[PDB]
Design an enzyme around this catalytic site. Structure first.
Site, PDB file in Angstrom:
ATOM      1  N   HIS A   1       0.850  -1.177   0.000  1.00 54.79           N
ATOM      2  CA  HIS A   1       0.000   0.000   0.000  1.00 54.79           C
ATOM      3  C   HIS A   1       0.883   1.222   0.000  1.00 54.79           C
ATOM      4  CE1 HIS A   1      -3.542   2.504   1.496  1.00 54.79           C
ATOM      5  NE2 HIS A   1      -2.588   3.306   1.876  1.00 54.79           N
ATOM      6  N   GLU A   2       1.769   1.230   1.002  1.00 55.00           N
ATOM      7  CA  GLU A   2       2.595   2.419   1.141  1.00 55.00           C
ATOM      8  C   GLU A   2       3.571   2.616  -0.022  1.00 55.00           C
ATOM      9  OE1 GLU A   2       1.696   3.884   3.493  1.00 55.00           O
ATOM     10  OE2 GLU A   2       1.021   2.442   5.118  1.00 55.00           O
TER      11      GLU A   2
ATOM     12  N   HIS B   1       1.980   4.314  -2.871  1.00 52.85           N
ATOM     13  CA  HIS B   1       1.944   5.771  -2.819  1.00 52.85           C
ATOM     14  C   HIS B   1       3.118   6.392  -3.580  1.00 52.85           C
ATOM     15  CE1 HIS B   1      -1.648   6.497  -0.499  1.00 52.85           C
ATOM     16  NE2 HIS B   1      -1.224   5.879   0.573  1.00 52.85           N
TER      17      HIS B   1
ATOM     18  N   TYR C   1      -3.636  14.559  -2.430  1.00 54.93           N
ATOM     19  CA  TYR C   1      -4.089  13.762  -1.287  1.00 54.93           C
ATOM     20  C   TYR C   1      -5.203  14.459  -0.538  1.00 54.93           C
ATOM     21  CZ  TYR C   1      -3.504   9.993   2.074  1.00 54.93           C
ATOM     22  OH  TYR C   1      -3.695   8.891   2.860  1.00 54.93           O
TER      23      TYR C   1
ATOM     24  N   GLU D   1      -5.716   6.694  -2.300  1.00 62.36           N
ATOM     25  CA  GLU D   1      -5.862   5.659  -1.281  1.00 62.36           C
ATOM     26  C   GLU D   1      -6.347   4.314  -1.820  1.00 62.36           C
ATOM     27  OE1 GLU D   1      -5.401   4.858   1.997  1.00 62.36           O
ATOM     28  OE2 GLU D   1      -3.924   6.428   1.656  1.00 62.36           O
TER      29      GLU D   1
ATOM     30  N   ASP E   1     -10.016  13.886   7.833  1.00 66.60           N
ATOM     31  CA  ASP E   1      -9.279  12.899   7.032  1.00 66.60           C
ATOM     32  C   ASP E   1      -9.030  13.385   5.612  1.00 66.60           C
ATOM     33  OD1 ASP E   1      -8.057  10.391   6.342  1.00 66.60           O
ATOM     34  OD2 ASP E   1      -9.981   9.605   5.742  1.00 66.60           O
TER      35      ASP E   1
ATOM     36  N   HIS F   1      -9.536   8.144   3.357  1.00 64.30           N
ATOM     37  CA  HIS F   1      -9.578   6.739   3.781  1.00 64.30           C
ATOM     38  C   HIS F   1     -10.987   6.198   3.952  1.00 64.30           C
ATOM     39  CE1 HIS F   1      -5.546   7.921   5.288  1.00 64.30           C
ATOM     40  NE2 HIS F   1      -5.288   6.694   4.863  1.00 64.30           N
TER      41      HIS F   1
END
Ligand SMILES: [Ca+2]
Ligand SMILES: [Ca+2]
Ligand SMILES: [Ca+2]
Ligand SMILES: [Ca+2]
Ligand SMILES: [Zn+2]
Length: 316
Positions: A142-143, A146, A157, A166, A226, A231
């Site tokens: 996931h990271e 990015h 974002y 996301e 958020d 998310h």
């Protein structure tokens, strides 16, 4: 560092033994020279200065408790590298074999992991909400995704571009999880979330609503929290991706599944050739339809399935 490539062995966060690529020069460092311009793992030593010190070990054995998060950050970065190279012919996150750097033991009781624009950072969790987050292959991937997004579409974002950002990370997180093929699912973070509760996870792509995330555009969050729900509203796109791969009937709209590999190819192409920093959900639909058209043709099952899936989550 300059040295010679070696192979260490240790245990990750869930207690599994694995081999890791290291480099020897007096100490054995977590530096894998076999992938691109290297994969490098650092110790942040419970502080927040980054990256910390390149991980050094005296004997090339990584079985200590303290070692476990490093073992998995390092190994899962390699798996993620292999996925992008083998499946999409992409060499590291920039497409030019940029070095991949990760730090573990970030801060104290830190219940998160992130890409900071330059590198991967993993908390250890507080042992209640999370255990060390590099234990989760979907979290690692996931990271790192990015970074791929930042170098390609550059989705801002916040608001819908941010929710797409996301979802892209959850989609490829999950495809990397399936690639590795160890307990794969369409949930996110289940391997490291809430060790005293079985069966849950941070998010679900298959049924985002299980954790209160929207699964239709009519339920999108429109407040300020958020970064405008990045998310949260990711669930709308996650559901669409799930349906494209797996099929289903959602609010009465049936989708013909086309499987994970085509899902990956369609979304990779959208990400790298069509999406832009300000894309919204409708633009994402257009990008995915055009990518499927490019790959499979206008009259294909694949194009119709992408339309059905976005219809089902209310995105026109
Ligand atoms: Ca050791
Ligand atoms: Ca899993
Ligand atoms: Ca998962
Ligand atoms: Ca749990
Ligand atoms: Zn993310």
């Amino acid at each position: 560092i300059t040295g010679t490539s070696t192979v260490g062995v240790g245990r990750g966060v869930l207690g599994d033994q694995k081999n890791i690529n290291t480099t020897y020069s007096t100490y054995y460092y977590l530096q894998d020279n076999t992938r691109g311009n290297g994969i490098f793992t650092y110790d942040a030593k419970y502080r927040t200065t980054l990256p910390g010190s390149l991980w050094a070990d005296a004997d090339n054995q990584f079985f200590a408790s303290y070692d476990a998060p490093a073992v998995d950050a390092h190994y899962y970065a390699g798996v993620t590298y292999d996925y992008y190279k083998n499946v999409h012919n992409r060499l590291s996150y920039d497409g030019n074999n940029a070095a991949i750097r990760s730090s573990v033991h970030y801060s104290q009781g830190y219940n998160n992991a992130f890409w900071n624009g330059s590198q991967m950072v993993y908390g250890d969790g507080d042992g209640q909400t999370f255990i060390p987050l590099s234990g989760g292959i979907d979290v690692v991937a996931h990271e790192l995704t990015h970074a791929v997004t930042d170098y390609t579409a550059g989705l801002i974002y916040q608001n819908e571009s941010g929710a797409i950002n996301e979802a892209i990370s959850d989609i490829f997180g999950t495809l990397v999880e399936f690639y590795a093929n160890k307990n794969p699912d369409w949930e996110i973070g289940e391997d490291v979330y809430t060790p005293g509760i079985s069966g849950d996870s941070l998010r679900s792509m298959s049924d985002p609503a299980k954790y209160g995330d929207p699964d239709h555009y009519s339920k999108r969050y429109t407040g300020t929290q958020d970064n405008g729900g990045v998310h949260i509203n990711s669930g709308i796109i996650n559901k669409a991706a799930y349906l494209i791969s797996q099929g289903g009937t959602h609010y009465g709209v049936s989708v013909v599944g086309i499987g994970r590999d085509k899902l990956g190819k369609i979304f990779y192409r959208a990400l790298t050739q069509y999406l832009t920093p300000t894309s919204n959900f409708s633009q994402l639909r257009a990008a995915a339809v055009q990518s499927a058209t490019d790959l499979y043709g206008s009259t294909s099952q694949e194009v119709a399935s992408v339309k059905q899936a976005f219809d089902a989550v209310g995105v026109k």
